[PDB]
């Protein structure tokens, strides 16, 4: 309850502190985290209609679901997002037991 | 980057570790965080179409937007949701400078 408060505060501080675009998905491919730089890249003003969407709705060429399926990181992937060429790094997220529970893309210009 | 991986892992752990339903919104009333228990109570299988939705489209009687306006915690509100009766405690979430950046409801089984 207060513990959820502090987590939400640290979440927002980390996302805001990262200059690159961040998009995280869960195991089913739903976007669960996104920072302001990624929303700008995708052409959105805020999290409404972006969080809780399948990643392939907003990024049809995303390899984040392949990172979930394989557990394999992918680095230095060029891709086009809204007429801009960006470089994507994609890493799996694991729980304490080593199960892949999501994946993150980092986009830089 | 690695930091986001660790944060995601700690979030998931902490969201499962709470037995109450959790729903969190940002200052615009958009759902930004939810746990398995709140999803089950809402009648959803996953975060899809729950995250990123304005709170009153899923919880019409929610006072979470009231908490954003007033900056003030609200306790002991009885609620029907999954045809289940629950008690909602609602607090504001502040950044390190004490500005309100969101609000969270805890749902306790009556
Ligand atoms: Mg490419």
Author numbering:
A (entry chain AAA): 200 to 308
B (entry chain BBB): 200 to 309
Wording from the paper:
Crystal structures of PASc reveal both anti-parallel and parallel dimer conformations. The N288D mutation in the PASc domain retains the same function as the wild-type (WT) CitA. Both the WT PASc and N288D PASc eluted as a dimer from a size exclusion column (SEC) down to a concentration of 1 μM, maintaining the dimer state in solution as hypothesized for membrane bound CitA. In agreement, the parallel or anti-parallel dimer arrangements were found to be the dominant forms in solution, respectively, for the WT or N288D PASc domain based on the following two methods. An inter-N308C distance of 41.3 Å was obtained in the N288D mutant PASc, which agrees with the expected distance in the anti-parallel dimer arrangement. Although this dimer exchange seen in the WT PASc is functionally more relevant, its occurrence in the N288D PASc mutant helps to rationalize why this point mutation does not disturb the functionality of the full length CitA.
Membrane bound histidine kinases (HKs) are ubiquitous sensors of extracellular stimuli in bacteria. Here, we used solid-state NMR in conjunction with crystallography, solution NMR and distance measurements to investigate the transmembrane signaling mechanism of a paradigmatic citrate sensing membrane embedded HK, CitA. The PASp and PASc domains are connected to the TM2 helix by two linkers: the PASp/TM2-linker and the TM2/PASc-linker (topology and domain organization shown in Fig. 1A).
